[PDB]
Amino acid sequence: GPMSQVLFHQLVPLQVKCKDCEERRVSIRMSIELQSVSNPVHRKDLVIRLTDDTDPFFLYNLVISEEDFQSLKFQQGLLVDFLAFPQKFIDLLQQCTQEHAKEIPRFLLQLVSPAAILDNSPAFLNVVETNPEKHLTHLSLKLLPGNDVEI
């Protein structure tokens, strides 16, 4: 079976945005794990998971294999390789967390759905930086509803 190493696990403030409504959820438990298998073949995956301590139905995840990361790096225009990606993402999440109490946060973590409702469609986890001139999106990840593993 795959063994997991937790690289990040904490409550994060999340702005959930649907077509006609936006809600701030403060009890979102976000984790980043490195999962590995050694036999018969050595393989590493990065798993990103969002759960909600106060809502058992809210679940999103993304599994990124070390071989699938080169596509994501290109799609997102990233400068980091697979092994450097967790620390880049964690540093952004720490900046989001440090701005949790601000009325106008400099860094925001948001989950955006193009639908009017949260459903079985993917939603986009964005890290946005705010400033007087314009908003910058540092990262967008397409998360799937549900958990990475059954139940």
Author numbering: -1 to 149
Show me the paper's own sentences about this structure.
Centriole assembly requires oligomerization of the essential protein spindle assembly abnormal 6 (SAS-6), which forms a structural scaffold templating the organization of further organelle components. SAS-6 is an essential protein for centriole formation and a key component of a scaffold-like structure known as the “cartwheel” or “central tube”. Crystallographic, EM, atomic force microscopy, and biophysical studies of SAS-6 variants from multiple species have shown that SAS-6 oligomerization is driven by two dimerization interfaces mediated by the protein “head” domain and a homodimeric coiled-coil domain. The SAS-6 head domain also self-associates but with lower affinity (Kd of 50–100 μm in vertebrate, nematode, and algae SAS-6) and a smaller dimerization interface compared with the coiled-coil domain.
Similar to earlier assays of CeSAS-6N, we employed dimerization-impaired variants of these domains (C. reinhardtii SAS-6N (CrSAS-6N) F145E and HsSAS-6N F131E) to ensure that the hydrophobic cavity of the dimerization interface is solvent-exposed. To elucidate the location of A11 and A12 binding to HsSAS-6N, we assigned the NMR spectra of this domain and determined the crystallographic structure of HsSAS-6N F131E at 1.46 Å resolution. Comparison of the HsSAS-6N head domain structure to that of other resolved SAS-6 variants revealed that the human protein is most similar to CrSAS-6N and the Danio rerio SAS-6 head domain, with sub-0.7 Å root mean square deviation (RMSD) of Cα atom positions. In contrast, the HsSAS-6N structure diverged more strongly from that of CeSAS-6N (∼2.8 Å Cα RMSD), largely driven by repositioning of the α1 and α2 helices. We assigned the HsSAS-6N F131E NMR spectra and quantified the spectral changes upon addition of compounds on a per-residue basis, which allowed us to locate the most affected amino acids on the domain structure. Both A11 and A12 perturb amino acids surrounding the dimerization interface, whereas addition of other compounds did not produce a similar pattern. A12 binding involved fluctuating interactions of the methylpiperidine moiety with multiple residues of the HsSAS-6N dimerization cavity (Leu-76, Val-78, Phe-83, Lys-86, Phe-87, Leu-90, His-136, and Leu-137), compared with A11 where similar but tighter interactions were formed by the compound aromatic group. We observed the formation of two stable hydrogen bonds between the A12 sulfonyl group oxygen and the HsSAS-6N Leu-77 amide and between the A12 acetamide and the Gly-75 carbonyl atoms. As seen in MD simulations of HsSAS-6N with A12, the available hydrophobic interface in this orthologue is larger than originally thought on the basis of other SAS-6 structures, and this interface could be exploited by “growing” the methylpiperidine moiety, thereby gaining human SAS-6-specific enthalpic contributions to the interaction.
